[PDB]
Enzyme design. Structure first.
Site, short mmCIF file in Angstrom:
data_model
loop_
_atom_site.label_atom_id
_atom_site.label_comp_id
_atom_site.label_asym_id
_atom_site.label_seq_id
_atom_site.Cartn_x
_atom_site.Cartn_y
_atom_site.Cartn_z
N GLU A 128 -5.49 15.70 -1.62
CA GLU A 128 -5.90 16.90 -0.89
C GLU A 128 -5.61 18.14 -1.72
OE1 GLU A 128 -4.83 17.48 3.41
OE2 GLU A 128 -3.48 19.02 2.62
N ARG A 149 -3.29 11.58 13.12
CA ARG A 149 -2.00 11.66 12.47
C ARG A 149 -1.96 12.82 11.48
NH1 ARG A 149 -3.15 11.22 6.88
NH2 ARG A 149 -1.39 10.24 5.80
N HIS A 151 0.78 -1.23 0.00
CA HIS A 151 0.00 0.00 0.00
C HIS A 151 0.81 1.28 0.00
CE1 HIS A 151 -3.64 2.24 0.06
NE2 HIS A 151 -3.37 2.82 1.22
N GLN A 207 -8.60 7.23 11.15
CA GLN A 207 -8.70 8.50 10.45
C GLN A 207 -9.37 8.36 9.09
OE1 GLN A 207 -5.18 10.80 8.87
NE2 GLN A 207 -5.63 12.06 10.67
N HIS A 225 -9.18 5.89 6.04
CA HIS A 225 -7.92 6.11 5.34
C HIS A 225 -6.65 5.65 6.05
CE1 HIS A 225 -5.08 8.15 2.70
NE2 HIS A 225 -4.65 8.91 3.69
N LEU A 268 -8.38 7.42 -4.04
CA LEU A 268 -8.02 8.73 -3.53
C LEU A 268 -7.82 9.86 -4.52
CD1 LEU A 268 -7.65 9.90 -0.74
CD2 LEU A 268 -5.19 9.56 -0.98
N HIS A 308 -10.61 10.16 5.24
CA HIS A 308 -10.18 11.13 4.25
C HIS A 308 -11.47 11.71 3.71
CE1 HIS A 308 -7.19 12.60 1.20
NE2 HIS A 308 -8.34 12.95 0.65
N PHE A 350 0.93 20.73 2.48
CA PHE A 350 0.19 19.49 2.69
C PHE A 350 0.11 19.21 4.19
CE2 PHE A 350 -0.18 14.83 2.84
CZ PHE A 350 -1.25 14.67 1.99
N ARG A 393 -8.86 19.12 7.63
CA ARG A 393 -9.36 17.90 6.99
C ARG A 393 -10.39 17.26 7.91
NH1 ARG A 393 -4.84 13.52 7.06
NH2 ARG A 393 -4.97 14.32 9.20
C1 LIG Z 1 -4.04 4.09 1.49
C2 LIG Z 1 -3.23 5.35 1.33
C3 LIG Z 1 -2.37 5.72 2.36
C4 LIG Z 1 -1.59 6.90 2.26
C5 LIG Z 1 -1.67 7.74 1.11
C6 LIG Z 1 -2.56 7.36 0.06
C7 LIG Z 1 -3.33 6.20 0.14
C8 LIG Z 1 -4.26 5.81 -0.97
N1 LIG Z 1 -0.93 8.89 0.97
C9 LIG Z 1 -0.09 9.24 1.98
C10 LIG Z 1 0.70 10.44 1.85
O1 LIG Z 1 0.66 11.15 0.87
N2 LIG Z 1 1.54 10.76 2.91
C11 LIG Z 1 1.62 9.94 4.08
O2 LIG Z 1 2.36 10.30 4.93
N3 LIG Z 1 0.90 8.82 4.20
C12 LIG Z 1 0.05 8.44 3.21
N4 LIG Z 1 -0.68 7.31 3.31
C13 LIG Z 1 -0.63 6.34 4.41
C14 LIG Z 1 0.78 5.66 4.21
O3 LIG Z 1 1.03 5.42 2.83
C15 LIG Z 1 0.87 4.41 5.04
O4 LIG Z 1 0.62 4.61 6.43
C16 LIG Z 1 2.25 3.74 4.84
O5 LIG Z 1 2.62 3.56 3.44
C17 LIG Z 1 2.20 2.41 5.60
O6 LIG Z 1 3.55 1.62 5.38
P1 LIG Z 1 3.72 0.24 6.02
O7 LIG Z 1 5.17 -0.13 5.68
O8 LIG Z 1 3.44 0.27 7.38
O9 LIG Z 1 2.72 -0.71 5.44
P2 LIG Z 1 2.27 -1.15 3.97
O10 LIG Z 1 2.98 -0.44 3.04
O11 LIG Z 1 0.77 -1.20 3.92
O12 LIG Z 1 2.66 -2.63 3.85
C18 LIG Z 1 2.11 -3.72 4.67
C19 LIG Z 1 2.85 -5.02 4.22
O13 LIG Z 1 2.42 -6.11 5.09
C20 LIG Z 1 2.23 -7.30 4.25
N5 LIG Z 1 1.36 -8.11 5.08
C21 LIG Z 1 0.17 -7.74 5.67
N6 LIG Z 1 -0.38 -8.73 6.38
C22 LIG Z 1 0.48 -9.78 6.24
C23 LIG Z 1 0.45 -11.15 6.77
N7 LIG Z 1 -0.51 -11.61 7.54
N8 LIG Z 1 1.52 -11.95 6.40
C24 LIG Z 1 2.54 -11.50 5.60
N9 LIG Z 1 2.65 -10.26 5.07
C25 LIG Z 1 1.59 -9.43 5.42
C26 LIG Z 1 1.67 -6.76 2.99
O14 LIG Z 1 1.74 -7.65 1.92
C27 LIG Z 1 2.61 -5.55 2.77
O15 LIG Z 1 3.75 -5.81 2.03
O1 LIG Z 2 -4.75 13.56 -0.21
C1 LIG Z 2 -3.77 12.78 -0.26
O2 LIG Z 2 -3.02 12.69 -1.31
C2 LIG Z 2 -3.23 12.18 1.00
C3 LIG Z 2 -3.84 12.43 2.23
C4 LIG Z 2 -3.32 11.85 3.52
O3 LIG Z 2 -2.30 11.12 3.53
O4 LIG Z 2 -3.99 12.17 4.56
#
Ligand SMILES: *Cc1cc2c(cc1C)nc1c(=O)[nH]c(=O)nc-1n2C[C@H](O)[C@H](O)[C@H](O)COP(=O)(O)OP(=O)(O)OC[C@H]1O[C@@H](n2cnc3c(N)ncnc32)[C@H](O)[C@@H]1O
Ligand SMILES: O=C(O)/C=C/C(=O)O
Ligand SMILES: *Cc1cc2c(cc1C)nc1c(=O)[nH]c(=O)nc-1n2C[C@H](O)[C@H](O)[C@H](O)COP(=O)(O)OP(=O)(O)OC[C@H]1O[C@@H](n2cnc3c(N)ncnc32)[C@H](O)[C@@H]1O
Ligand code: HEM
Ligand code: HEM
Ligand code: HEM
Ligand code: HEM
Ligand SMILES: CCCCCCCCCCCCO[C@@H]1O[C@H](CO)[C@@H](O[C@H]2O[C@H](CO)[C@@H](O)[C@H](O)[C@H]2O)[C@H](O)[C@H]1O
Ligand SMILES: CCCCCCCCCCCCO[C@@H]1O[C@H](CO)[C@@H](O[C@H]2O[C@H](CO)[C@@H](O)[C@H](O)[C@H]2O)[C@H](O)[C@H]1O
Ligand code: SF4
Ligand code: F3S
Ligand code: FES
Ligand code: NA
Lengths: 655, 239, 254, 254, 55
Positions: free
Chosen positions: A270, A404, A43, A255, A369, A267, A257, A141, A301
């Protein structure tokens, strides 16, 4: 029995997991990264807003430093965060950006000259001096006064994730995808690894390690409407919860969005609103000004989401076969502006909404979100279960509290990856584990038996119908606005849903590559996570950050200046056990006060806050009078810890 | 109404001794702004939970859902049923990748192998101090690197490549693009001769027959045509 | 065999432990030989089409290629050397380009299937390149050998003879479309392969090159059919059993 | 494209989940086409060598192949169909056998090096098979097309004309060694490949087949040179500028 | 540190080692056979006398 050993086991291949894996692998520890999917598809790749870090390069970033970023973070959290952690974060974010720049991340750079910019207070021109040319840029932002959000054009998460993943490949980290951790191996209060199911072959394998880190992301998919990828289901959260020892923190803190595309949840940055986008109702009426005469659509927001729902409840929402929504109008920004600064949002609306934002309005509705809640850890990233660490969105390191900052979460993923990575590395190199095959066999055979029971179940419940009902309940009762009566109803239905999940029957009997079997064991886990969120919301009788209780509209610093800790000690109980960790005001650098956004005096003041505040003003005055720098003052107010490798100060343009 | 769509899907389970490759058809009633993502999940939850496929972001940003849609490798989450005037959609897994089951293939591990093969990371003798100011980079340069860094490793250009289909060791368009992405990055100290040791052979840049299908199917619209030619001119001039 | 070739064969690298530069050289020569033949053919279609301007016209050109301004009536042997040279390039090109053909059942089946599913223009055009190339192994050789060994039989009368009396028109008809499709597509791909004209708007350059390719083919095919008809018509008028048409044009100025 | 071909291409097996039988068919046809051409050539060398027995001799045979006992003076068009048929087999064989050539720099370098290090007879002979095969793409096509389109020009006088006046002897000289070496080695390998004559003492059978192969080649090469000289000698005696040698043999019995 | 686990570890790929590995692997125990050389090249391969058994 199949067993795999490594010194450092990382569950999750997002920014947090991969960065932590770099930390352990670089010091010679054999490390394995497990992931449901190829790591570059995590993600984290979807972040387009940017990453928050106090570089202070650009004109609008001039004068920014750790203290300003810190204050924005704490006040944003509505004082629910661990301030020492927030300090660790803000001081390290600048180095994370610079390390990534060194690894090739193509951060957008500053060029000398005037610039057509939007400020929404004085939308004048901005000038960047020559000594700023070529340095890392930043944009507006997250609602921070100082523009400190760094970005690589419109795909920041993407480039960041790719750089970290590539560093892992460079270092020889073992990346094993289509592998799912379904249980943690533990004994005597220590974590020795995880039981893993190979998604392709169905093989159940034990991954043992001296230390295990969970960086599995958020649990947004327990909601029907979410911006999250379909894999953000919180199973990582659930396996920690199912040990009966590790605790989950502030699961009720979710949180939303305000402008995701409806009903897909894709998405719409913003930047739409920040640039001048207008929210309209069923009659095309620009409504924000009616609720926020001053801030209008440029309001917090947090406030925009609330007003949008309020407006919908007043009957001004747009009726749709998928539910009610509102409109986002950016056509007013001009066609030329959209095809140069918002070319991405244009493609999104066209590709999925089948519309051109330069001519028609986009359907929007607030949706889940980010997950502030997660596995509770100390400042080092270690959970109550020894040897188990957590980092990223999956954790409750708690630098976020109940809200956050936009831009702080991708920042935390890499920063925690760095910091927790060091402590995790130290733990793995210094600890000695006693791996009893009796225990390994118990856990492995236990999951093989479970898979078999699911495949042979003669139950008549439909796993998808159960999952979909869970998502509806969460959206309808645990959203932006909550109240006791509805929350009680939600907790009861979720508990009923959980019990029925045990009577699920599946059609496909194979043990390998079976998406139906996957849902059969994931849904029960999601339900337990949902129960922690719902029950946590029900019991927290106050309104703090993103958690809004209509029946308890005030922030209660007297009885609720704490953190919700959820556990599931007895595998028989059908509800989570909730305890509370009190926040010591005496250890806060910034005493509780006004958060900046929302109604004033909307919080029940705590006497201890007044005492501390005075004590702070006093310490600041004396030290500042003796010609002491901000660093020495910070130390006297609240000393915090940092790995030796990151205890250095951040050089800035102007020192 | 919404017109009935006829969905034909490739089904085959190599891990099952009794499975035989075949097509299965499903009748789905189209809805407004319906994508293949919606179609496949509908089939999964209400008609056939056996069907394997891979979705993650459902937003066209992760590259997880590539598959052959009516003969063209495309991102299923970004493909609209409305664009098929006929109502008949045929889905096949991406060729040129190891098949897992039905519409699910292993693109991820082939890409990690390619990334290792072309040493997809910054090569530099010294580590810049992360507590100090970053090294300055011209904005135009940063923009150029970003343009090529946009690859989401979806595999569409790999499956679209007749050359790769016939000769499996061919590094592919994504591999050649990756090389250029580092070639033009000032942070990377590799020279043209270093790059030649990586892709200066018949499984590399010289293996490209300029079919250009990669260019025409890339969902991110990378400048594959001109960039591969650029690389070819440079590699043929080494020594 | 040499020590160096043995070391390369067994180690996979040169004695200096580097990858061989031969693949680069071969790639260069394949394109170079291709470019030569492609351009040669364009000039070839113009000089051979002079029959449309009149017997005296092409007859004049034919004598120039035989070095009229250096020799009496021009020595046809000059055309022999030119033919041998082109034949050599023809062979070298086929040798190098042949490396690109699908080479086994699996490759043939999967590529053909892919081509039919994709309906991608440039991919389909490559298949045509390969098909026409294979066909020219047999069609081109016949013509090249004859031109190289019977240069004194080239002319408005003599060429028309071979075209009809010696039944060379069926071969010329097929070869016309084969070499024109192969050559035009070949020159087009050559441009996008090396990107000599990409510039700042690559997609626009390619769009124009594609249009150019189609026109060039159209013009040359029609001109080729016109020229074809001219030779046939004249050849069909040679009915006198007492006239030696084969060496008629030669029997004018030695 | 068909559903079945798509399923095979994407799954690697037929709809019944079995490996395709096409590789077996192609292997069969490659050998079958090879056997046909090999045997055809042996008979070809005998019928063409009748020139050694006298003009009247081969002239008699030439008329038989034109169905003399069915048509007046025999219709040469019969030879055209026979030529077209052999041409088709020639093309099919080349198409199938071409699959066996080394196809890239690596394959060519490593095999050539291996051949030189090994000094293994049967391995070296295969290289000759490949080389001669490639050469015949150009040499064989020229002759086949001519025989198919100018059958009325076959005879003791007419054939000698083409051999010398039309400069076909250089092509025939090279082609003679090319097709004989290719054919004899080809028939030999065919026998050991399918082992039709292995029996109880395989090594002895192979030893004899190798000896037979060498003799067959020797006999045919010499006989080919003798026949070659005969055609040349006669062709070098055709000096009268008022005689139409090309169609002389034809101008005897329509 | 590099660690490899199996239920039954057999050191030696001669007749004795390989036959014992058959015994453990057939009952579902993961077994690894380690050998200095490809197992079919073990000294056991040199026996030309024969094997004693009271048939
Ligand atoms: C959804 C979202 C979030 C987001 C954003 C836009 C969107 C559409 N824009 C952001 C932005 O502009 N600025 C910001 O600061 N944050 C923003 N966010 C949120 C942010 O991207 C996330 O909080 C961040 O990327 C989270 O990173 P994290 O390393 O913690 O996690 P992840 O990337 O989701 O990866 C999770 C991994 O875990 C593996 N997984 C999950 N469950 C399991 C199990 N059971 N077993 C094995 N592996 C597992 C997933 O496959 C993945 O690789
Ligand atoms: O609007 C976006 O692109 C991201 C928002 C957020 O990370 O809160
Ligand atoms: C030497 C000999 C023995 C022999 C014989 C003829 C010769 C030349 N003829 C025999 C006969 O006709 N009848 C008979 O009954 N015995 C005959 N023998 C003796 C007999 O062959 C041996 O006793 C028998 O084969 C021994 O079998 P065993 O399975 O015990 O051992 P092995 O075949 O020698 O294989 C030893 C393996 O161990 C591996 N190895 C050794 N050290 C290590 C270490 N440190 N680490 C890992 N692997 C190791 C070797 O690589 C080998 O695979
Ligand atoms: C006068 C006749 C010919 C002309 C005008 C000609 C011209 C060309 C040109 C312009 C190219 C481009 C080369 C490149 O991309 O580097 C090409 C490609 C090719 N030609 Fe020819 N050619 C001729 C005869 C042949 C013959 C006899 C063969 C037989 C093997 C052949 C096989 C090929 C093939 C297969 C390609 C594609 C090569 C690749 O994809 O890299 N050509 N030719
Ligand atoms: C230097 C060598 C060449 C010379 C001197 C030459 C000469 C000629 C001449 C004089 C003709 C007219 C008819 C005749 O005299 O038989 C002709 C026709 C033709 N040539 Fe060539 N040629 C050469 C090479 C080639 C090559 C390499 C190709 C392609 C493989 C080619 C393809 C054709 C075709 C298709 C025609 C038919 C023209 C039409 O009907 O429009 N020629 N050539
Ligand atoms: C009249 C002429 C020809 C004769 C008498 C002839 C005959 C033969 C024979 C007897 C074989 C054995 C086939 C087998 O082992 O299954 C053979 C093999 C072969 N021929 Fe020809 N051939 C002729 C022309 C050609 C041509 C034009 C090519 C051009 C591609 C060619 C390429 C080959 C090759 C490469 C092999 C080896 C096939 C293998 O190793 O499987 N042949 N031929
Ligand atoms: C059914 C088709 C064929 C017919 C009717 C035929 C006919 C003839 C004739 C009449 C000659 C005498 C000289 C002349 O008239 O130009 C000749 C010579 C020759 N043919 Fe063929 N031929 C055929 C197929 C082949 C094939 C497939 C090859 C090999 C690729 C071949 C190789 C030769 C050679 C090398 C000579 C020279 C004989 C010598 O000088 O010893 N022929 N052929
Ligand atoms: C078009 C020119 C081809 C370039 C030459 C190099 C590539 C082709 C030869 C190498 C591969 C062998 O090619 C093999 O040929 C046989 C024809 O007998 C094909 O056979 C298939 O196509 C032919 C032609 O449409 C059909 O009549 C036949 O029924 C069908 O089964 C095989 O599917 C192919 O794999
Ligand atoms: C003999 C007939 C060959 C059958 C056709 C199929 C196999 C050959 C073509 C495919 C492989 C490409 O072949 C490539 O050709 C070039 C010639 O320009 C060779 O080049 C090498 O040999 C040639 C010939 O002795 C030398 O003049 C040259 O200096 C040397 O570097 C490459 O080592 C070879 O790998
Ligand atoms: S280059 Fe384009 S098609 Fe190829 S993997 Fe990258 S994004 Fe996908
Ligand atoms: S389609 Fe393949 S042949 Fe080259 S131009 Fe693209 S990588
Ligand atoms: S699901 Fe990520 S691109 Fe389609
Ligand atoms: Na969290």
């Amino acid at each position: 029995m199949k067993v795999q050993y490594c010194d450092s086991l990382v569950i999750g291949g997002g920014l947090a997991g991969l960065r932590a894996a770099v930390a352990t692998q670089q010091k010679g520890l054999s490390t394995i990264v497990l992931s449901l999917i190829p790591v570059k598809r995590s993600h984290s790749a979807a972040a387009q807003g940017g990453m928050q870090a106090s570089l202070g390069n650009s004109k609008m970033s001039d004068g920014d430093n750790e203290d300003l970023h810190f204050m924005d973070t704490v006040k944003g959290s509505d004082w629910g965060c661990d301030q020492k952690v927030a300090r660790m974060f803000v001081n390290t974010a600048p180095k994370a950006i610079r390390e990534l720049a060194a690894w090739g991340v193509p951060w957008t750079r500053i060029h000398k000259g005037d610039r057509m910019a939007i400020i929404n207070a004085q939308k004048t021109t901005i000038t960047e001096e020559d000594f700023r040319h070529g340095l890392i840029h930043s944009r507006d932002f997250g609602g921070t006064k100082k523009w400190r959000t760094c970005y690589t054009a419109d795909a920041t998460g993407h480039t960041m994730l790719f750089a970290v993943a590539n560093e892992c490949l460079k270092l020889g980290v073992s990346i094993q995808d289509r592998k799912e951790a379904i249980a943690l191996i533990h004994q005597d209060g220590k974590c020795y690894g995880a039981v893993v199911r190979d998604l392709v072959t169905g093989d159940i394998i034990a991954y043992v390690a001296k230390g295990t880190l969970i960086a599995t992301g958020g649990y947004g998919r327990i909601y029907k409407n979410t911006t999250n990828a379909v894999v953000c289901e919180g199973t990582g959260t659930a396996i920690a919860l199912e040990t009966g020892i590790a605790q989950l923190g502030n699961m009720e803190a979710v949180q939303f969005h305000p402008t995701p595309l409806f009903p897909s949840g894709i998405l719409l940055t913003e930047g739409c609103r920040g640039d001048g986008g207008i929210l309209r109702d069923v009659d095309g009426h620009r409504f924000m000004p009616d609720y926020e005469p001053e801030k209008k659509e440029l309001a917090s927001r947090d406030v925009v989401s609330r007003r949008m729902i309020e407006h919908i409840r007043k009957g001004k929402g747009v009726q749709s076969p998928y539910g009610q929504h509102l409109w986002l109008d950016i056509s007013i920004l001009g066609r030329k502006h959209i095809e140069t600064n918002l070319r991405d949002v244009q493609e999104i609306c066209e590709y999925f909404a089948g519309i051109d934002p330069a001519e028609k309005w986009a359907p929007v509705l607030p949706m889940q979100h980010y997950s502030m809640g997660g596995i509770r850890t100390d400042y080092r990233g270690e959970a109550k279960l020894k040897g188990l660490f957590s980092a990223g969105e999956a954790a409750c390191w708690d630098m976020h509290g109940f809200n956050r900052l936009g831009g702080n979460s991708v920042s935390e993923a890499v920063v925690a990856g760095m910091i927790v990575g060091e402590y995790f590395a130290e733990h793995c190199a210094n600890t000695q584990v006693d791996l009893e095959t009796k225990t390994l066999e118990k856990f492995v055979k236990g999951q093989e038996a479970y898979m078999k029971s699911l495949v042979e179940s003669k139950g008549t419940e439909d796993v998808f119908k159960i999952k979909n009902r869970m998502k509806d309940v969460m959206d309808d009762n645990v959203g932006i606005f909550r109240d006791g009566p509805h929350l009680e109803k939600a907790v009861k239905e979720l508990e009923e849903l959980y019990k029925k999940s045990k009577n699920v029957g599946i059609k496909n009997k194979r043990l390998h590559a079976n998406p139906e079997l996957e849902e059969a064991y994931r849904v029960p886990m999601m339900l337990k996570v949902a129960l922690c969120v719902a029950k946590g919301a029900l019991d927290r009788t106050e309104s703090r950050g993103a958690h809004n209780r209509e029946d308890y509209p005030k922030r209660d610093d007297i009885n609720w200046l704490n953190r919700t800790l959820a556990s599931w000690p007895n595998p028989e109980q059908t509800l989570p056990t909730l305890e509370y960790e009190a926040l010591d005001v005496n250890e806060m650098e910034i005493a509780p006060g006004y958060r900046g956004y929302g109604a004033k005096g909307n919080y029940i003041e705590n006497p201890l806050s007044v005492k501390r505040q005075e004590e702070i003003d006093k310490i600041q005055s004396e030290l500042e009078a003796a010609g002491k720098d901000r660093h020495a003052i910070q130390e006297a107010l609240m000393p915090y810890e940092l790995p030796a490798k990151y205890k250095a100060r951040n050089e800035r343009l102007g020192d | 109404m919404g017109r009935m769509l006829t969905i034909r899907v490739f089904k085959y389970d190599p891990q099952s001794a009794v499975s035989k490759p075949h097509f299965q058809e499903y009748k789905i009633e189209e809805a407004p702004s319906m994508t293949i993502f919606i179609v496949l999940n509908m089939i999964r939850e209400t008609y056939d939970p056996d069907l394997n496929f891979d979705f993650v972001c459902r937003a066209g940003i992760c590259g997880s859902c590539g598959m052959m849609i009516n003969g063209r490798p495309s991102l299923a989450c970004r493909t609209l049923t409305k664009d098929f005037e006929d109502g008949v959609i045929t889905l096949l897994p991406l060729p040129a990748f190891k098949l897992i089951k039905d519409l699910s293939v292993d693109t991820g591990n082939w890409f990690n192998g390619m990334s290792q093969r072309v040493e997809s990371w910054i090569h530099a003798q010294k580590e810049h101090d992360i507590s100090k100011l970053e090294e300055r980079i011209e904005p135009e340069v940063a923009q150029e690197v970003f343009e090529l860094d946009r690859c989401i490793e979806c595999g569409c250009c790999i499956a679209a490549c007749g050359t790769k289909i016939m000769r499996e060791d061919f590094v592919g368009a994504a591999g050649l693009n990756r090389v250029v992405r580092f070639m033009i990055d000032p942070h990377d100290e590799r020279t043209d001769e270093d790059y030649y040791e990586l892709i200066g052979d018949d499984d590399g840049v010289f293996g490209c027959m300029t079919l250009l299908a990669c260019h025409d199917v890339c969902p991110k619209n990378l400048p594959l045509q001109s960039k591969i030619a650029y690389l070819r001119r440079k590699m043929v001039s080494v020594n | 065999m040499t020590n160096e070739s043995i070391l390369e064969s067994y180690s996979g690298v040169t004695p200096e432990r580097k990858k061989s530069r031969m693949p680069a050289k071969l790639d260069w020569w394949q394109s170079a030989t291709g470019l030569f033949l492609g351009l040669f053919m364009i000039g070839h279609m113009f000089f051979v089409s002079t029959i449309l301007l009149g017997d005296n016209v092409m007859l004049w050109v034919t004598k120039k290629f035989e070095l009229d301004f250096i020799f009496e009536g021009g020595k046809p042997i000059v055309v022999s050397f030119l033919a041998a040279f082109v034949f050599a390039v023809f062979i070298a090109h086929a040798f190098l380009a042949m490396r690109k053909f699908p080479i086994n059942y699996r490759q043939y089946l999967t590529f053909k299937t892919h081509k039919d599913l994709m309906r991608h223009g440039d991919t389909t055009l490559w298949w045509i390149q390969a098909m026409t190339g294979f066909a020219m192994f047999f069609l081109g050789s016949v013509h090249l050998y004859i031109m190289m060994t019977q240069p004194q039989t080239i002319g408005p009368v003599s060429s028309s003879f071979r075209m009809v009396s010696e039944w060379m028109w069926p071969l010329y008809l097929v070869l016309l479309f084969a070499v024109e499709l192969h050559g035009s597509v070949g020159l087009y791909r050559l441009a996008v392969k090396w990107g000599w004209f990409d510039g700042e708007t690559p997609d626009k350059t390619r769009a124009n090159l594609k249009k150019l390719k189609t026109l060039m083919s159209a013009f040359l095919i029609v001109l080729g059919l016109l020229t074809f008809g001219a030779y046939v018509k004249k050849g069909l008028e040679q009915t006198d059993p007492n006239i030696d048409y084969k060496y008629f044009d030669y029997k004018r100025t030695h």
